[PDB]
Structures are given as C-alpha cells and as structure tokens.
Amino acid sequence: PQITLWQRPLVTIKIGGQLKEALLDTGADDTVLEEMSLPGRWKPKMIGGIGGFIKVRQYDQILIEICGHKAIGTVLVGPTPVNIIGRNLLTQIGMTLNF
Amino acid sequence: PQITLWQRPLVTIKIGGQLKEALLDTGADDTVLEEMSLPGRWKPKMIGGIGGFIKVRQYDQILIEICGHKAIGTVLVGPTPVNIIGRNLLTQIGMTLNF
Numbered sequence: 001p002q003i004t005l006w007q008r009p010l011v012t013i014k015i016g017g018q019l020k021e022a023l024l025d026t027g028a029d030d031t032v033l034e035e036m037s038l039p040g041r042w043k044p045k046m047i048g049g050i051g052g053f054i055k056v057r058q059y060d061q062i063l064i065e066i067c068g069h070k071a072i073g074t075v076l077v078g079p080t081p082v083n084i085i086g087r088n089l090l091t092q093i094g095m096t097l098n099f
Numbered sequence: 100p101q102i103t104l105w106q107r108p109l110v111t112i113k114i115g116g117q118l119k120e121a122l123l124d125t126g127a128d129d130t131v132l133e134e135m136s137l138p139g140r141w142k143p144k145m146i147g148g149i150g151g152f153i154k155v156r157q158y159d160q161i162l163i164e165i166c167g168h169k170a171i172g173t174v175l176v177g178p179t180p181v182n183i184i185g186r187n188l189l190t191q192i193g194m195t196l197n198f
C-alpha cells in the first residue's frame with residue numbers, strides 16, 4: 001500500500017513479545033528504540049542527530065514484525081525520545097520513497 | 100521516480116540559486132538546513148532531535164527545489180548534522196512511502 005506524509009508515518013511493531021509505536025524514518029540509518037530488554041550480546045555505540053549524541057546498546061539479528069512482514073535486523077536501544085525504524089529494516093520489508 | 104533505501108536517500112536541492120545535498124527524511128516534521136543566508140526576517144523555533152533540543156531560525160515562504168520539483172515553504176536553519184528535507188516539503192513534492 002501507500003503511506004501519505006501529511007502526518008508522521010507511525011506503525012506498530014512486534015519485538016521481544018512487546019508492542020511498540022514507531023516512526024518509519026528514511027532519515028535514520030538504524031532502528032532506535034527506547035530502553036527495553038533484548039536477548040543476546042550487544043556492543044556500546046554512540047549515535048548523533050539534531051541535539052547531539054546519545055549512547056545506545058547495539059543488538060544484532062533481532063526479529064521484528066512490521067507492516068505484516070517478519071524482518072531481521074540491528075536494533076539500537078537507548079534514551080531516544082521516539083521509537084525509530086531505520087533504513088536497515090525498511091529495506092527488508094521492501095519500502096521505498098516514491099514521487 | 101522511486102528511491103530505494105539501501106543507501107541514504109540524498110538528493111540535490113536548489114535554494115538561493117545554489118545546489119546542495121539533502122536527506123529525504125520522513126522522520127522529520129520540518130526541513131532543517133545547515134548554516135546559510137536566506138532573505139527576509141526570521142522567527143525563533145525550538146526543535147527536538149535524538150540528542151536533545153536546538154535553536155533554529157525559521158524562514159517562511161522560501162523557494163526551494165527538491166529533485167527538480169519546485170516548492171515554497173518553511174525552512175529552518177541551525178546546527179544539524181546534515182541538510183534534512185522534512186514532511187512539510189516532502190508533501191509539497193508528492194512524496195510518499197510505499198511497500
């Protein structure tokens with residue numbers, strides 16, 4: 001389907017048994033979610049944007065359900081003001097920008 | 100046209116008669132550009148990003164071309180890691196997300 005941009009493109013994702021509201025963000029290289037528990041090993045990382053940098057934990061190979069698809073990707077967990085779905089996951093579900 | 104997301108959706112924009120590279124950002128409500136000179140008066144605006152809040156200069160009804168499409172709208176100028184084209188202008192050029 002087609003998703004208009006008059007409003008923030010929000011979607012409900014399923015991850016780690018939890019439901020979260022997230023933003024389909026083409027400007028985000030990676031997916032960044034608010035503090036939560038995830039299985040497996042992680043590496044500390046620093047990501048920057050408007051306002052500066054925030055420290056996050058990088059988890060790889062995480063299963064995420066979004067827009068009916070079941071995708072695998074890296075998830076960065078940290079003090080982000082909003083849950084963001086980055087390009088690393090958007091590509092997996094075949095999402096593109098059209099005009 | 101269609102733009103995939105395997106790489107950053109960087110496009111050429113034209114503002115003030117000069118070409119610049121900007122990021123098509125669906126996760127951004129507004130368009131924020133790096134320091135530059137724009138005509139007329141500006142109003143103050145506070146925007147919050149991933150690392151916190153920053154002060155930006157708000158210019159209205161500014162002529163700006165994105166991917167060759169002409170738009171006239173609000174442009175914010177301030178300390179941003181990269182030029183970002185937000186939904187306020189993405190909607191003016193008929194940009195949508197599809198999957």
Ligand SMILES: COc1ccc(S(=O)(=O)N(CC(C)C)C[C@@H](O)[C@H](Cc2ccccc2)NC(=O)O[C@H]2CO[C@H]3OCC[C@H]32)cc1
Nearest residue numbers: 027028029030047048049050082126127128129147148149
């Ligand atoms: C490495 O992985 C990364 C993932 C995400 C980011 S990032 O979040 O700083 N970024 C990138 C953008 C600032 C270039 C995504 C932007 O679209 C970012 C996502 C976001 C962050 C906080 C709150 C709302 C929305 N949008 C953003 O900064 O938008 C600015 C400009 O318009 C306003 O909308 C609300 C916030 C304001 C950085 C790195």
